[PDB]
Amino acid sequence: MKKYVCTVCGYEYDPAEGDPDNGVKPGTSFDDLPADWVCPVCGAPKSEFEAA
Ligand code: NI
């Protein structure tokens, strides 16, 4: 229940799912994501992500 969103394009991330774009398992936390990880939609850095 931490579904965040991008502050550039708007790509609701799923922590309970992960992220194949880069390679993440379900039940993971964004913060857990790598630094080289970025909104795989626009580009914005993970630093531009917040929990709405
Ligand atoms: Ni974005």
UniProtKB/Swiss-Prot annotation:
Cofactor(s) recorded in Swiss-Prot or TrEMBL: Fe(3+)
Co-factor note (free text): Binds 1 Fe(3+) ion per subunit.
Keyword presence, Zinc-finger: no
Residues binding Fe cation, per UniProt: C6, C9, C39, C42
SUPFAM superfamilies, alphabetized: Rubredoxin-like
InterPro entries named among the record's database cross-references: Rubredoxin, Rubredoxin-like_dom, Rubredoxin_dom, Rubredoxin_ET, Rubredoxin_Fe_BS
Subcellular location(s) of the protein: Cytoplasm
Database matches in Gene3D superfamilies: 2.20.28.10
One Pfam family linked to the record: Rubredoxin
GO annotations of cellular component type: cytoplasm
Domain Rubredoxin-like per the UniProt entry, residue ranges: 1-52
Keywords: Cytoplasm, Electron transport, Iron, Metal-binding, Transport
GO terms assigned for molecular function: electron transfer activity; iron ion binding
Ranges that cross the membrane: none
Example of a GO biological process term: alkane catabolic process
Family note: Belongs to the rubredoxin family.
Function in brief: Rubredoxin is a small nonheme, iron protein lacking acid-labile sulfide. Its single Fe, chelated to 4 Cys, functions as an electron acceptor and may also stabilize the conformation of the molecule. Electron acceptor for cytoplasmic lactate dehydrogenase.
Name listed for the protein in its UniProt record: Rubredoxin
